[PDB]
UniProtKB/Swiss-Prot annotation, chains A, B:
Domain of life per record: Viruses
Protein name: Major capsid protein
Known role: Self-assembles to form an icosahedral capsid with a T=16 symmetry, about 200 nm in diameter, and consisting of 150 hexons and 12 pentons (total of 162 capsomers). Hexons form the edges and faces of the capsid and are each composed of six MCP molecules. In contrast, one penton is found at each of the 12 vertices. Eleven of the pentons are MCP pentamers, while the last vertex is occupied by the portal complex.
Cell compartments where the protein resides: Virion; Host nucleus
Family: Belongs to the herpesviridae major capsid protein family.
Residues of the full protein shown: 124 to 172 of 1396
Subunit and interaction comment: Homomultimer. Makes the hexons and eleven out of twelve pentons. Interacts with triplex proteins 1/TRX1 and 2/TRX2; adjacent capsomers are linked together in groups of three by triplexes, heterotrimeric complexes composed of one molecule of TRX1 and two molecules of TRX2. Interacts with scaffold protein; this interaction allows efficient MCP transport to the host nucleus. Interacts with capsid vertex component 2/CVC2. Interacts with the small capsomere-interacting protein/SCP.
Protein species of origin: Varicella-zoster virus (strain Dumas) (HHV-3)
Length: 49, 49
């Protein structure tokens, strides 16, 4: 004669990641880090670029 | 890690031509350049032709 059976199962978290890169030339860093020293006509177009 | 790329290309004009010809008989030249000399009834039909 048979009797009912119960089950108990446990799983776990596996961890992953995603990495994406992004670069800037040092020319643009010098172009943005002025702090109110520059502002001539030819530099504004380069900053906008 | 991968970084996004940009592509710059330049394409160039190639130049060609088309040629067609058109001829005049010498009799038609000497007959179309009377400049009020003959005024006859027979050469008027040749001028129209």
């Amino acid at each position: 004669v048979d009797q009912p059976v119960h089950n108990y199962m446990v799983k776990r978290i596996h961890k992953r990641s995603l990495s994406a890169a992004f670069a800037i030339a040092s020319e643009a860093l010098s172009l943005l880090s002025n702090t109110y020293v520059d502002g001539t006509e030819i530099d504004s177009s380069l900053r906008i670029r």
